[PDB]
Amino acid sequence: APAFSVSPASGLSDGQSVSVSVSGAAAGETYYIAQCAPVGGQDACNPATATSFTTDASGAASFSFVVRKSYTGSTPEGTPVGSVDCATAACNLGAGNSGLDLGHVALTFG
Numbered sequence: 483a484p485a486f487s488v489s490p491a492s493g494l495s496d497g498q499s500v501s502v503s504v505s506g507a508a509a510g511e512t513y514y515i516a517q518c519a520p521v522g523g524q525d526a527c528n529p530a531t532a533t534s535f536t537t538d539a540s541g542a543a544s545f546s547f548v549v550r551k552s553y554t555g556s557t558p559e560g561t562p563v564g565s566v567d568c569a570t571a572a573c574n575l576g577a578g579n580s581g582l583d584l585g586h587v588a589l590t591f592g
């Protein structure tokens with residue numbers, strides 16, 4: 483598995499933007515990055531922050547991604563699951579695409 487880390491990862495805030503950076507990947511591929519949050523049963527991701535970033539010549543990447551304490555969850559397949567709120571709940575950003583999974587960083591608004 484390649485590497486994937488974010489600057490901060492706790493006591494975050496809505497609108498707060500962190501500088502993420504992935505490595506070990508390979509130039510010639512694009513991965514989707516977005517915040518998500520499971521719900522003791524299914525999985526709801528953010529359909530708003532769904533951007534696709536490609537790696538560089540050395541298969542490395544690094545950019546600024548904003549976050550949102552609260553956000554309506556919704557499986558990436560195409561179905562509404564409900565609303566989510568990290569104000570007092572648990573959340574975790576995930577990256578990767580259909581072929582190469584990057585990593586999963588847990589966040590914590592507070």
Ligand SMILES: C=C1Oc2cc(OC)cc(C(=O)O[C@H]3COC(=O)C[C@H]([NH3+])c4cc(O)c(c(Cl)c4)O[C@@H]4c5ccc3cc5C3=CC=C[C@@]34O[C@@H]3OC(C)(C)[C@@H](N(C)C)[C@@H](O)[C@H]3O)c2NC1=O
Pocket residue numbers: 514515516518526527528529530531532533555556557558559560575576577578579580581582583584585586
């Ligand atoms: C147009 C988009 O619209 C949405 C809507 C949404 O609902 C809120 C959530 C996400 C999102 O960001 O989902 C994220 C949600 O993040 C996670 O799910 C984190 C989890 N750690 C994870 C889940 C997962 O399925 C996966 C990986 Cl690498 C990681 O594989 C690939 C993967 C990684 C991340 C995501 C989804 C997948 C796919 C689903 C099935 C296989 C995957 O492979 C993905 O399968 C599809 C079918 C999703 C595909 N499709 C053409 C987009 C493309 O994204 C492909 O990389 C997006 N992204 C979009 O591109």
